[PDB]
Design a protein around this ligand. Structure first.
Ligand SMILES: CC(C)(Sc1ccncc1-c1ccc(C#N)c2ccccc12)C(=O)O
Ligand SMILES: *[C@@H]1O[C@H](CO)[C@@H](O)[C@H](O)[C@H]1NC(C)=O
Length: 515
């Protein structure tokens, strides 16, 4: 097949333009995925109390601190209890002579009158709008997990649909669905509707990712292919910084969601100018349309070759693809081969570790540090050089030590956040940034490495297994946080042990550098 690109030009003006456009689309995609850090931030909260909140009631010489103590008992975090209040005002607690032994838990009640939230940092968030707190605290990670599960469903759907309807058309309708579902998610009235709309948005996102990957690889020459995939991965690194920049200015989750959704309308517009997959069309036996697209691309590259192509070379040079694609090969076939089974196990577990760790950590930054805006921007800042160095090291030390070191370093960096004492926020934030950068480098390493571990026929199906495993682990990511009720060390230790274990497994993979 390559000869057609070598004729039309495999890395010309057209490829540069298309790469820039799809990288921009991925930037906005990353903003969409990161948003739940800022759209669902948990502001500090307490029960509503008659003395504290009824501004028309009798004011007194007592300051707000003393009244707060008179109204609400202390919680485990050496801070006001976040879910219950005193049944009757504890005037006896005004004195320093008082002791907490004076009040029974029977003297306390849950927030019958609802909650009061801090508005200083975020003006409005999902948590404060639909009271996803206390008894309902499980629902926030539930929302994140549902969003991530929509991606698994979307991939399983968009595979067949993309083959039936073509890459560009599915990408276009995916952009449109992202726009419509996202703007609806901003205005939605009630939490079930928000869950539904986030799920459909995930259904769109899966298609965007898969079809972008397919479209870039088809039009890119073989030797430049890893670099193009690396740029597609750097799009997310820039997306982190974009999320920080947007969230700093916009503090209202309705407006934030609306702002990050609208740009996808523009992608719907300019995706109409991009060309359809040539290989898909030729497989569909339509050489006239494929040749129209090809000579259009050649015109963009300014070549003379528009006068030289014929349908016979177009069809014949793809005859091998047409013949080989007929075979009934899927995941079950991959598991049969004696020499491939161990490779499959370890590769799948590496994808699983990536999804698990990244979507566990990157969506609750509020727990890893002290200022989530700067933490987001620094995740971007560290991810960029981490991925570029990952490429520059992967091409020299071999896939095996590069991937193994990436995963092991990421896991050990995250584990360090358990051991460093809670109050040292600066060092903890730095370690968290480094760990997430390590996971990004591991993503690049595994993307390139998995493509080489398998024979050319099974390559794409094995990559499919890997991606599905990554999404499966991402779904479990958020649920791990529910264990945090028993303490913060347990969720973070679970997040840290898995990537280290998979890294020690990655060390056993066969090398594939051209040694
Ligand atoms: C889960 C994956 C494998 S990826 C994905 C899906 C949804 N949200 C974000 C990402 C994502 C996470 C880390 C990356 C890194 N480094 C990255 C790079 C490029 C594109 C997406 C990601 C998929 O379903 O395809
Ligand atoms: C607030 O205090 C005023 C004081 O006159 C009272 O009339 C009113 O019922 C109170 N409302 C609430 C909700 O506490």
């Amino acid at each position: 097949f390559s000869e057609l690109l070598d004729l039309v030009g495999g890395l010309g003006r057209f490829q540069v333009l298309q790469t820039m456009a799809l990288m921009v689309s991925i930037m906005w995609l990353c903003t969409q995925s990161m948003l739940e850090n800022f759209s669902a931030a948990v502001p500090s909260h307490r029960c509503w109390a008659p003395l504290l909140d009824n501004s028309t009631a009798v004011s007194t010489s007592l300051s707000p601190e003393a009244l707060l103590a008179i109204s609400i008992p202390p919680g485990p975090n050496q801070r006001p209890h976040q879910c219950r209040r005193f049944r009757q005002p504890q005037w006896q607690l005004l004195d320093p002579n008082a002791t907490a032994t004076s009040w029974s838990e029977a003297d306390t009640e849950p927030c019958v009158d609802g909650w009061v939230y801090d508005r200083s940092i975020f003006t409005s968030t999902i948590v404060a709008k639909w009271n996803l707190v206390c008894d309902s605290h499980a629902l926030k990670p539930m929302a994140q997990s549902i969003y991530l599960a929509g991606i698994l469903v979307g991939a399983a759907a968009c595979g067949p649909a993309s083959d039936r309807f073509g890459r560009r058309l599915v990408l276009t309708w995916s952009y449109l669905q992202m726009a419509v579902m996202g703007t609806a998610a901003a205005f939605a009235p009630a939490f079930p509707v928000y869950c539904l709309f986030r799920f459909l948005l995930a259904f769109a996102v899966a298609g965007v990712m898969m079809n972008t990957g397919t479209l870039l690889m088809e039009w890119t020459a073989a030797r430049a292919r890893p670099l193009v995939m690396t740029l597609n991965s750097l799009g997310f690194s820039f997306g982190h910084g974009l999320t920080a920049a947007v969230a700093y200015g916009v503090r209202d989750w309705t407006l934030l969601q609306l702002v990050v959704s609208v740009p996808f309308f523009l992608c719907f517009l300019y995706s109409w100018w991009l060309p359809e997959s040539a290989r898909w069309l030729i497989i569909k036996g339509k050489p006239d349309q494929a040749l129209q697209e090809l000579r259009k691309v050649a015109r963009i590259n300014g070549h003379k070759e528009a006068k030289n192509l014929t349908i016979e070379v177009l069809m014949s040079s793809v005859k091998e693809e047409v013949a080989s694609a007929k075979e009934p090969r899927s995941v079950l076939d991959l598991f049969c081969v004696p020499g491939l089974r161990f490779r499959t196990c370890i590769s799948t577990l590496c994808w699983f570790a990536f999804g698990f760790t990244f979507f566990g950590l990157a969506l609750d930054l509020q727990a890893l540090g002290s200022n989530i805006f700067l933490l987001q921007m620094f995740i971007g800042v560290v991810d960029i050089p981490a991925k570029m160095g990952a490429l520059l090291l992967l091409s020299h030390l071999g896939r095996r030590p590069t991937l193994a070191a990436s995963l092991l370093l990421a896991g050990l960096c995250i584990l360090a956040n358990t051991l460093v004492p809670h109050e040292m926020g600066a060092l903890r934030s730095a370690l968290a940034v480094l760990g997430l950068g390590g996971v990004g480098a591991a993503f690049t390493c595994i993307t390139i490495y998995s493509s080489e571990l398998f024979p050319t026929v099974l390559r794409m199906t094995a990559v499919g297994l890997g991606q599905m495993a990554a999404r499966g682990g991402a779904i479990l990511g958020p649920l791990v946080r529910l264990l945090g009720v028993h303490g913060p060390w347990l969720p973070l230790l679970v997040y840290g042990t898995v990537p280290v274990l998979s890294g020690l497994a990655a060390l056993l993979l066969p090398e594939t550098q051209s040694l």
